[PDB]
Amino acid sequence: TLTDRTYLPPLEDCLTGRTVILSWRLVASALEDADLARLTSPALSTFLRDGFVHELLKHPARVFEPKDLKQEFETKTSSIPGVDTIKKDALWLADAVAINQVAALRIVLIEYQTRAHSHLVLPLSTQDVANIQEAAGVGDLSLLNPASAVDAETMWCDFETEARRRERILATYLSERRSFTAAVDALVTFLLHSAPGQHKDLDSLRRALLKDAFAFDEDLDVPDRSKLLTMAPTYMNLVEDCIARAQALPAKLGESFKTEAFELDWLRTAITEAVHSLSIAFQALDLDTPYFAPHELLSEWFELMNSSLFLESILGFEVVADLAMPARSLVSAICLKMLNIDRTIQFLHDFGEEPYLLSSQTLNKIHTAVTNAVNSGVAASLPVAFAWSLIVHQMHLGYQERAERPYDDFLREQRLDNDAPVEQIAMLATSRGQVYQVMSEMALCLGTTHEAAFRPAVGARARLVFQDLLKRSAYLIPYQDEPVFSLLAILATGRQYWDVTDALSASSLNQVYTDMLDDETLFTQFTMQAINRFPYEFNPFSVLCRVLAAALITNKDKADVVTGWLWRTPTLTVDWNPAWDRSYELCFEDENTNSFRLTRDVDLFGEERFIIPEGTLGRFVTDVTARLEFEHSALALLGKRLEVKAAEEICDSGMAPLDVDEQAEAVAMLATVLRAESLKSTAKGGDPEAPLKFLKEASRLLPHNKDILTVISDTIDGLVEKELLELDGPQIAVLASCLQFLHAALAVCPGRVWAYMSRCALIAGDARPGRLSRITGSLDMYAERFDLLSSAVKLFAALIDSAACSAVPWLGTSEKILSRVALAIAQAALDVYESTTTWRFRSELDRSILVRDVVGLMHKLVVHAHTLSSHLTSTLSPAAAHIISSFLTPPPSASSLRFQPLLGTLLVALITPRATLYPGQSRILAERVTSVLAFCTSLLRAADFLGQTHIPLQTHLFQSACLLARLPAANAVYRAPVLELLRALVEVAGREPPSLLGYLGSHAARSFISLVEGIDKPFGRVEHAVVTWRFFAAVIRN
DSSP: OOOOTTTSOOHHHHHHTSSOOOOHHHHHHHHHHTOHHHHTSHHHHHHHHOHHHHHHHHOGGGGTOOOOOHHHHHHHHTTOOOHHHHHHHHHHHHHHTTOOHHHHHHHHHHHHHTHHHHHHTSOOOHHHHHHHHHHHOSOOOOOOOOTTOOOHHHHHHHHTSHHHHHHHHHHHHHHHHHHHHHHHHHHHHHHHSOOTTOOHHHHHHHHHHHHHHHOOOTTSSSOOOHHHHTHHHHHHHHHHHHHHHHTOOOSSSOTTTOOHHHHHHHHHHHHHHHHHHHHHHHHHHHHTOSSOOOHHHHHHHHHHHHHHTTTTTTSOSGGGHHHHHHHHHHHHHHHHHHHOHHHHHHHHHOOOOOOGGGOHHHHHHHHHHHHHHHHHTOGGGHHHHHHHHHHHHHHHHHHHHHOOOOHHHHHHHTTOSOOOHHHHHHHHHHGGGHHHHHHHHHHHHTSSSTTOSSOHHHHHHHHHHHHHHHHHHHTTSOOOHHHHHHHHHHHHTTOOGGGOOOOOOOGGGGHHHHHHHHOHHHIIIIIHHHHHTTBTSHHHHHHHHHHHHHHTTTOSTTTTHHHHHHTTBOOEEEOOOGGGTTSEEEOOSOTTTOEEEESSOEETTOOOOOEEOTTOEEEBOOOOOEEEOOOBOHHHHHHHHHHHHHHTOOOTTSOOOOOHHHHHHHHHHHHHHHHHHHHHHSSTTOOTTHHHHHHHHHHTTSOTTOOHHHHHHHHHHHHTTSOTTTSOHHHHHHHHHHHHHHHHHHTTOHHHHHHHHTTOTTSOOSSOOOSHHHHOSSOEEOHHHHHHHHHHHHHHHHHHHHHHHOOOOOTTOOHHHHHHHHHHHHHHHHHHHHHTTTOEESSHHHHHHHHHHHHHHHHHHHGGGGGOSGGGOOTTHHHHHHHHHHHSSOOHHHHHHHHHHHHHHHHHHHHSOOOSSOHHHHHHHHHHHHHHHHHHHHHHHHHHHHTOOOOHHHHHHHHTHHHHTTHHHHOGGGHHHHHHHHHHHHHHHHOOOOOHHHHHOHHHHHHHHHHHTTOSTTTOOHHHHHHHHHHHHHHOOO
């Protein structure tokens, strides 16, 4: 009793617009975003609760697989306005690409319902280009498209031809292939790894899917995971199909349509399906984490890794590089998951499914692919190969132990009963730390940063296999830089201070971090090793405190770990100063131990000082440093090391001074832990004075008139003695960290931070021009420089918040101070904003972050336009007037300059290809565009409120209307923003006004009003419906 009544609405409703088809593109978007309003809307909620859809999820071939469905197709098309063309295209497509008629019919109807969208994403016409050329302004990165643009009418006629329509249908077909795998991918995550506190309705939908579609009833003490686990072999078999399709285009399709643009789309589609298929299969295997997989699955899988060299046959082209890393990362991850090195080796030592070790067949299958991959040169296979070497190395042991008076068959088969060749792999992998750098790059790909290709949950659970690999090799490999920086990369994934959050996620997702404390092998061989070598080896311990402090904000049982390391540090490891050679004496216990004892007090940095007591037992680690057994406060000590480093005070008889690198890491580590302590302090059951205590301990054993915050202040002042152009890389990194520390301290000492900013050279004063304003120009925004300005904008923004939030701790400030500092911030912000036109960013994503945060900052000030009355001023009034007056009523050259970042944002939004991976990059871009649109809207509203008649921004936006009308076609997220802006624009101009539709053009106007005439049709969200109608009521005159 399973029908497609919901999956595919009746044909007449699709052609009239009464019912929009829930394309997999729409379904995937809602699931990737876990949007409450979309997923719990009746339309999409019924779609997901439907039994027919469920069978498609579990049987993915059926979605497009060809089959005899002529009767169903004829009944759906017979007896119902253009149906002749619809029925025609569906049959042509079904035969061309070998898909069943019903599936093809759905593709053709999606193209028909998205025809107004496809028209608006066409290259701009000659007229539109001229309009935006004037919007650019009088001035001369926002490099515009070429002059190949033609008349709008010419394009429309071409857009309606059978040839183009067929191309869009083919494009839609491939788009739905990608979006279906993606929707299932996101679906699995939504089901297995949703965050606690989920909304009631959303939780009901999650449980109803697990129970009805997978017989997974959470109300049971142990639910049945059978149907979920079958998703792995299901979608593993789909990965094989993608390999085949990528190597063979459709047979019957005509060469008219087999253009280079289609060949690439066909290839990228196959890779994308494989990645999301790998992501689905991995999450499925992960559900059964401790247990082994059926040996037949590995045998089948590694047989495919052999013929395709772990999918390298598909990823050989450079045009698929952005998809290659995601694929390689999950191929390596999913291979390691099945091998299960931890439970494999543990089974070899000690005595569900049977381990694949008991099947000499599978062991040969694996060894063939591994051997083939290494000899071929597959760099991505080293983590799998290195993992396979350690397994064979232990099998070689278990065989010799019994040679004194199933896998044995494999050892005798592959010349392993006796010597060596396996060791060649273990060396090629670790030679020059290759395998360790591979895992470090796969960590980022599977990371938490906004540059990760996959969602957090997939990355969190997947990085565990690379952690298990290091776990088992830790006892057999010495503690070195390569196997340690690799783990730190697996843990940190290049995260920064700004990525700290008290957001509670699924419990199982923090296992990679809690295993550093719960797993003996990792805890003793990595965590303790990092502690016992600090501060001689600075970074390893600093990163752990920085990472675990941010990851355990929500963990009660482990809330005192990092603080327990900073307070009450057990040991101290420093480079030995010859000046102490008279203050120790060996113990003569063991000739190898080399232990000793102190005979005189040692004064580091040689009131309240830091002294290592006489009679403290110690030990010399290497002769080519000493690990003293001395419990102390590494936080208090570090605070003093920063004070010394800031003052440039040499201490011949004391410990070594902080390196400039160590300095930046040190401050960043303090800012993170402080931020983590102030986040948990305001939570239920936390110590509300936790951050103050953290500052006091770091201020201990400092001069009486000096606390840790004074040191950071002095450090900033000292570095800005020169100008930013003269500073060095690591020095600029120190500034960034110091600004991140002010941000964390702002939450607990607002009066101190504000007090310092009033005399900070970075921003202008009533007597100084400001240092930041000097960095503007044509410089390049590379990592150290960008981190500085990014952190500066975020800090400036956080300050504006505290000024507005405070309606009445703050000792050391006044209204004059906040006013002047806020105004200087407004001036610095606008300078950074104007400079984004000329700076060279490492990546457009970097510019999207900066423009997002700067625009947000200036927006916070534009919102205070209501305070611009004589008897209603506030501390933000001057700052607000500086922004408002700079965008409203500026002269031409400045008007053009201040509009290009906005125009550049609109352009980047239209030329950025849609994607189902890299969700973080996509979100950031949307936040950028939404900021620009909202910022422009409030400026127009503020102009109307303040009486400003002549507004260049009004003219700038009309000439950019051709871009605004196309944004909702590029991404539905922009529909409501664009409509609220166009409404504000029309309303403000109305007070013979300009014609919105006159600027768009006859053709664009028609398709735009068509898109907007959907009125959030598929979902029917109230807030979206009201926005649409206020727009129609204000813009479209009956």
